[PDB]
C-alpha cells in the first residue's frame, strides 16, 4: 500500500455513512459505515467550475479574453452494482432515495486512502437481461464541499493496542473506567469499539478514549476491543465480586 | 430463489392487473393478473428526482454549490414482445392504450420478489422484417409512487450470537474450523468478523461464517468475534502448542 505510486484500481470498495458524528473527521474508520457489495462498476464525481468574465475596458492589450474561476461543483457520481433486494445496504439505499436526506458516502481506493463526498440519490435504475446478472444503477448528486483524498495525505499506523489488564474488583454500581492507548505514542487516525460479551452481568458505555464498565450481576466475563476496521484487538477480564 | 444473492435475470415475467381490488396489497398473488407471454426485451423505467437549488445568499462557504432532492418520477418502462394479436392480453393491452386509463403492471423476477408499477401506455410500435419475427413494442409512462421490491423485505436479527469455546488443541499448522451461529429461529442477517488479538502466536482466516485459525508460536491467545450490529461479541480461547 503505497499512496505515492500508481495503483491498478482493482479492489475499490464503496461505503455509506450511517452514524451521527463528523464523517470528515474520521474517514479511515469503518465503524459507522455500511458497505455496498459487488459493485459492477463505479465512476466518481467530477469537480467542475463555472467561469466569470474578468476583462474590463480600462485594461490595455485587450486582444485576448480573460476569465476567472467562480463557483465550483462536485459533480455526479455513478455506480452500478449487482441487484440484491434482500441484502442490507440496498434497502438502506432505497430508504435514502425515498426520504431524500443528504448523506455521506465514501470510496476506499486500493491505496490506503479514502475519498468521501456528501450528496443525495438523483437517479435509480435497473438493467434486467438474460445471460447476464441483473444490475441496479445508482446516480448521486453531490452537495457542499468534498473531502479530497489529497487533503489528509499523512496517515500513520503501527502495531498494537495497549490496555491495562486485570481490573478485578468491581463495586459501587461498578462504573469504573479502564485506560486504553495506542502503540505509536498515540499519534494516529484512531478508531475502536467495545461491548460486553454477555450483557447480563455487565455493560459498557464507551465514550471518548475511555472505556467505562457498569455491572448488574456477578460472574466472570471478558470484554473485547476492536480497532475500527479491526486490524487489532484486545481482551480484558471482569470478575464481578459479590460485595 | 435467494434475494440476498445476485441472479441471472433469465425467466423474468410480466403481468398486467385486471381485477378491481388494490394491486399494492398482495402483489405475490397471480389471481387477477394477465400474463404478457413471449417477451423479447424488457427495460424497466428508472426512478429519478429533479434537483432544487438550496443556495442561500447569507451562508458561509460559498466556494461550492449545493442542491437538494425535489420531486421524484417513476420513469417510462419499455418492453418488446412477439406480435400475436389473436392472443388475449395483447387485445387487452391495445384496449388499455385506446381508453388510456391508468393501470397497474407487475414484473416477476427470479428471486421471489416483484416490481409493481402504475402507469399508462404512451407508445405502441411494430418492427416487420423478413427472416425475423414480427415484434410489438410497448412503452408505459408511470405515475404516482411505484411499489419497489425493497418494500417487501423484512429483517430478522438480534438475540445475540454464539461460537464454540476453548478447543485448545492447537498444533502443526492447525487451520482449525470455528463455527459461529446465530440463535434466533435460524433466519437472521449474519454479518460478523473475528480478529486475532496477538497476530504472532496465532492468526485467523475469516471466511464465510467459518473461522480458520492457525498457530505459529506457542502461547495463549484469546481471539474475539464481533458482529456488525455492534452489540454481539464473544471470545474464544486458544493455546498454541510448540509440539
From Swiss-Prot, chains A, B:
Its annotated compartments are:
Virion; Host cytoplasm
Q: Which UniProt keywords apply?
A: Host cytoplasm, Viral genome ejection through host cell envelope, Viral long flexible tail ejection system, Viral penetration into host cytoplasm, Viral release from host cell, Viral tail assembly, Viral tail protein, Viral tail tube protein, Virion, Virus entry into host cell
Q: Which residues form the Big-1 domain?
A: 201-243
One BP term from GO: viral tail assembly
Which Pfam families does its entry note? Big_2, Phage_TTP_12
Q: Name one GO cellular component term.
A: virus tail, tube
Question: InterPro entries given for it?
Answer: Big_2, Phage_TTP_N
Q: Where is the BIG2 domain?
A: 158-236
Q: Does the keyword Transferase apply?
A: no
What role does it play? Forms the phage's tail tube composed of 32 hexameric disks. When it encounters the appropriate initiation complex gpM and gpL, it assembles in hexameric rings that stack on top of each others. Multimerization ceases when the correct tail length is achieved through a mechanism dependent on tail terminator protein.
UniProt subunit comment: Multimerizes into a structure formed by 32 hexameric rings stacked on phage baseplate gpM and gpL. Does not multimerize in solution without the tail initiation complex. Soluble major tail protein interacts with tail assembly protein GT during tail assembly.
Kindly provide the name given to this protein in its UniProt entry. Tail tube protein
What is the gene called? V
Amino acid at each position: 500500500p503505497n499512496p505515492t505510486m500508481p495503483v491498478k484500481g482493482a479492489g475499490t470498495t464503496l461505503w455509506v455513512y450511517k452514524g451521527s458524528g463528523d464523517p470528515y473527521a474520521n474517514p479511515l474508520s469503518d465503524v459507522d459505515w455500511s458497505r455496498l457489495a459487488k459493485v459492477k462498476d463505479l465512476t466518481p464525481g467530477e469537480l467542475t467550475a463555472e467561469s466569470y468574465d474578468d476583462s474590463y475596458l480600462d485594461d490595455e492589450d485587450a486582444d485576448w479574453t480573460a476569465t476567472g474561476q467562480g463557483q465550483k461543483s462536485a459533480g455526479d457520481t455513478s455506480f452500478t452494482l449487482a441487484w440484491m433486494p434482500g441484502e442490507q445496504g440496498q434497502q438502506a439505499l432505497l430508504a435514502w432515495f425515498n426520504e431524500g436526506d443528504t448523506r455521506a458516502y465514501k470510496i476506499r481506493f486500493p491505496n490506503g486512502t479514502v475519498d468521501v463526498f456528501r450528496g443525495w440519490v438523483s437517479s435509480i435504475g435497473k438493467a434486467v437481461t438474460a445471460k447476464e446478472v441483473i444490475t441496479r444503477t445508482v446516480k448521486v448528486t453531490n452537495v457542499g464541499r468534498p473531502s479530497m483524498a489529497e487533503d489528509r495525505s499523512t496517515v500513520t499506523a503501527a502495531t498494537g493496542m495497549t490496555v491495562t489488564p486485570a481490573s478485578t474488583s468491581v463495586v459501587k454500581g461498578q462504573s469504573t473506567t479502564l485506560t486504553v492507548a495506542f502503540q505509536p505514542e498515540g499519534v494516529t487516525d484512531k478508531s475502536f469499539r467495545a461491548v460486553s460479551a454477555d450483557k447480563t452481568k455487565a455493560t459498557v458505555s464507551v465514550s471518548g478514549m475511555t472505556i467505562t464498565v457498569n455491572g448488574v450481576a456477578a460472574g466472570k466475563v471478558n470484554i473485547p476491543v476492536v480497532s475500527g476496521n479491526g486490524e487489532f484487538a484486545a481482551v480484558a477480564e471482569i470478575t464481578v465480586t459479590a460485595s
